[PDB]
UniProtKB/Swiss-Prot annotation, chain A:
Organism, as annotated: Mycolicibacterium smegmatis (strain ATCC 700084 / mc(2)155) (Mycobacterium smegmatis)
Recorded family membership: Belongs to the ATPase B chain family.
Description of how the protein assembles with itself and partners: F-type ATPases have 2 components, F(1) - the catalytic core - and F(0) - the membrane proton channel. F(1) has five subunits: alpha(3), beta(3), gamma(1), delta(1), epsilon(1). F(0) has three main subunits: a(1), b(2) and c(10-14). The alpha and beta chains form an alternating ring which encloses part of the gamma chain. F(1) is attached to F(0) by a central stalk formed by the gamma and epsilon chains, while a peripheral stalk is formed by the delta and b chains.
Function as written in the Swiss-Prot or TrEMBL entry: F(1)F(0) ATP synthase produces ATP from ADP in the presence of a proton or sodium gradient. F-type ATPases consist of two structural domains, F(1) containing the extramembraneous catalytic core and F(0) containing the membrane proton channel, linked together by a central stalk and a peripheral stalk. During catalysis, ATP synthesis in the catalytic domain of F(1) is coupled via a rotary mechanism of the central stalk subunits to proton translocation. Component of the F(0) channel, it forms part of the peripheral stalk, linking F(1) to F(0).
Localization of this protein: Cell membrane
Residue numbers of the full-length protein present here: 58 to 114 of 170
Protein name: ATP synthase subunit b
UniProtKB/Swiss-Prot annotation, chain B:
Cellular location(s): Cell membrane
Gene, per the UniProt record: atpFH
Assembly with partners or alone: F-type ATPases have 2 components, F(1) - the catalytic core - and F(0) - the membrane proton channel. F(1) has five subunits: alpha(3), beta(3), gamma(1), delta(1), epsilon(1). F(0) has three main subunits: a(1), b(2) and c(10-14). The alpha and beta chains form an alternating ring which encloses part of the gamma chain. F(1) is attached to F(0) by a central stalk formed by the gamma and epsilon chains, while a peripheral stalk is formed by the delta and b chains.
Further comment: Binds 2-aminothiazole antibiotics, which are antitubercular agents.
The protein's name in its UniProt record: ATP synthase subunit b-delta
Physiological role: F(1)F(0) ATP synthase produces ATP from ADP in the presence of a proton or sodium gradient. F-type ATPases consist of two structural domains, F(1) containing the extramembraneous catalytic core and F(0) containing the membrane proton channel, linked together by a central stalk and a peripheral stalk. During catalysis, ATP synthesis in the catalytic domain of F(1) is coupled via a rotary mechanism of the central stalk subunits to proton translocation. This fusion protein includes a component of the F(0) channel (subunit b) and of the F(1) subunit (subunit delta). Two copies of subunit b and one of delta together form the peripheral 'stator' stalk which links F(1) to F(0).
Disulfide bond annotation, renumbered to this chain: none
Residues of the full protein shown: 1 to 50 of 445
Transmembrane regions: 3-23
Protein family per UniProt: In the N-terminal section; belongs to the ATPase B chain family. In the C-terminal section; belongs to the ATPase delta chain family.
Length: 57, 50
């Protein structure tokens, strides 16, 4: 029974590992993309504020 | 006396036959299964490490 357990769990752990490398890659990429998107939005807001201040002045 | 000896020679022949032609397949069969199980334990260990 435990022979079986080990074989199957080893299967799922190599599964976990193969899925977890992809999950770490995807999560790092998602966090990086979110940070870059927020940076771009901050730069765009800075440009919009510059346009507003130049227009008002 | 004579019967014992003759059946003892017969047992010697049987032992030789099994050791030469029956022992190699079975012992090594068990042996191959053994190798397999140990290497499976090994794969499990590796996966745990992974």
């Amino acid at each position: 029974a435990e022979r079986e357990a080990m074989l199957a769990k080893t299967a799922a752990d190599n599964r976990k590992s193969a899925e977890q490398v992809a999950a770490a890659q995807a999560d790092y990429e998602k966090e990086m993309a979110e940070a870059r998107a927020q940076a771009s939005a901050l730069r765009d807001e800075a440009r919009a504020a510059g346009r507003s201040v130049v227009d008002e002045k | 006396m004579s019967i014992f000896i003759g059946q003892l020679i017969g047992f010697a022949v049987i032992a030789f036959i099994i050791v030469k032609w029956v022992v190699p397949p079975v012992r090594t069969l068990m042996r191959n299964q053994q190798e397999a199980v140990r290497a499976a334990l090994a794969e499990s260990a590796e996966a745990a490490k992974k």
